[PDB]
């Protein structure tokens, strides 16, 4: 009886690997057929339309104390900006970046300045003596709140000063009416520096002298807003990857506007109608205004893929090929 079951199971294993190889050949031939079908632009348009219509039918790193302190610092920056002007914001961003460099270099000063206290008055006085003659008074008025508040780590004070300088530069960009161009260029440079891993890794020079990275940016890489932002960021990079830093710059820009960036992948650039339909559909899905950073690629031929936040909605010939290929018996 063991032999009888053994021969039956040998037969069953034979038919099973038969079915497996036949399914593999079938899915490979279907892959070739659909890869030939994907060549036509009308077919890609149909695929993206089907996926878009289907969809139509369908600060974080910081801990609590630093989070509250950064929120309050931005609330005061709101009051400062309500009276600011472009020419003044230009200097505000540079002076905030200068004090960020100071705190990043004179670490002994920074550790005292970031001390968590409610009676922070001495720290303010320490700043008042040290900076009152070096930088304009508005920067001091904002750094007063930056220092008085509480921070979870000595790093978050520098982070908040850098963030405030970045917001001031972005506010200059917004008042000048370049809100869209600066975002476009930030994403352009994001994808560039993500595709150029040699110069971008060389930009993460926080072990090397920063002015070299600054001059390298000036030589290699334009609206003066994006250039100022990149130069400030590489000057204050503190070991973060340059590409992931510039992409965070763009994320912050679009989130400051109020929207969120949804990265899109497709075989080719769609017409304006598809872009507007996709933006409206994504806004419906996630309940916010949105901007699409189309990272077109041929490898993901067919369909349409989107990733926003930590979530994905993916449709492509390749992803559905993976789904079909992994389901074989």
């Amino acid at each position: 009886a063991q032999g009888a079951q053994q021969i039956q199971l040998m037969r069953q294993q034979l038919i099973r690997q038969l079915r497996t190889g036949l399914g593999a050949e079938a899915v490979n031939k279907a892959a070739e057929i659909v890869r030939a079908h994907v060549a036509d632009p009308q077919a890609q348009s149909a695929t993206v339309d089907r996926f878009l219509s289907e969809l139509e039918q369908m600060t974080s790193r910081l801990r609590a104390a630093s989070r509250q302190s950064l929120a309050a610092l931005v609330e005061k920056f709101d009051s400062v900006a309500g009276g600011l002007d472009a020419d003044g914001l230009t200097n505000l961003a540079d002076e905030l970046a200068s004090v960020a460099k100071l705190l990043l270099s004179e670490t002994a000063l920074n550790k005292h300045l970031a001390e968590p206290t409610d009676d922070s008055a001495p720290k303010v006085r320490l700043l008042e003596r040290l900076l009152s003659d070096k930088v304009s008074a508005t920067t001091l008025d904002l750094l007063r709140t930056a220092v008085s508040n509480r921070w979870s780590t000595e790093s978050n004070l520098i982070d908040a000063v850098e963030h405030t300088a970045r917001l001031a530069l972005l506010k200059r960009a917004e008042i000048a009416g370049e809100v869209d161009e600066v975002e476009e260029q930030l994403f352009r440079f994001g994808r560039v520096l993500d595709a150029e891993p040699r110069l971008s890794a060389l930009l993460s020079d926080y072990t090397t002298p920063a002015e070299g990275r600054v001059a390298l940016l000036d030589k290699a890489l334009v609206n003066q807003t994006a250039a100022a932002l990149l130069s400030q960021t590489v000057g204050l990079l503190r070991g973060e990857r340059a590409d992931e830093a510039v992409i965070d710059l763009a994320e912050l820009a679009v989130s400051r506007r109020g929207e969120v960036v949804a990265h899109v992948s497709a075989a080719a650039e769609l017409s304006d109608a598809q872009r507007t339909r996709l933006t409206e559909v994504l806004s419906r899905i996630y309940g916010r205004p949105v901007s699409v950073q189309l990272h077109v690629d041929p490898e993901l031929l067919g369909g349409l893929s989107i990733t926003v936040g930590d979530e994905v909605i993916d449709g492509s010939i390749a992803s559905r090929l993976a789904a079909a290929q992994t389901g074989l018996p």
Binding site: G3, Q6, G23, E25, A26, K29, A30, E32, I33
Partner: protein, 50 residues
Amino acid sequence: RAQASGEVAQTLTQADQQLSAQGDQVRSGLESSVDGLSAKLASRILGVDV
């Protein structure tokens, strides 16, 4: 037990030969079936008629 073991080994050899012949014969047809299966799966993978 030894006699039954010999019978089992004979069954195993018969299985080997029968399944080799059946595998060849059935793969002969599977080669044809594969074209239609792949044609239909090309439609299912695309999510539209092809």
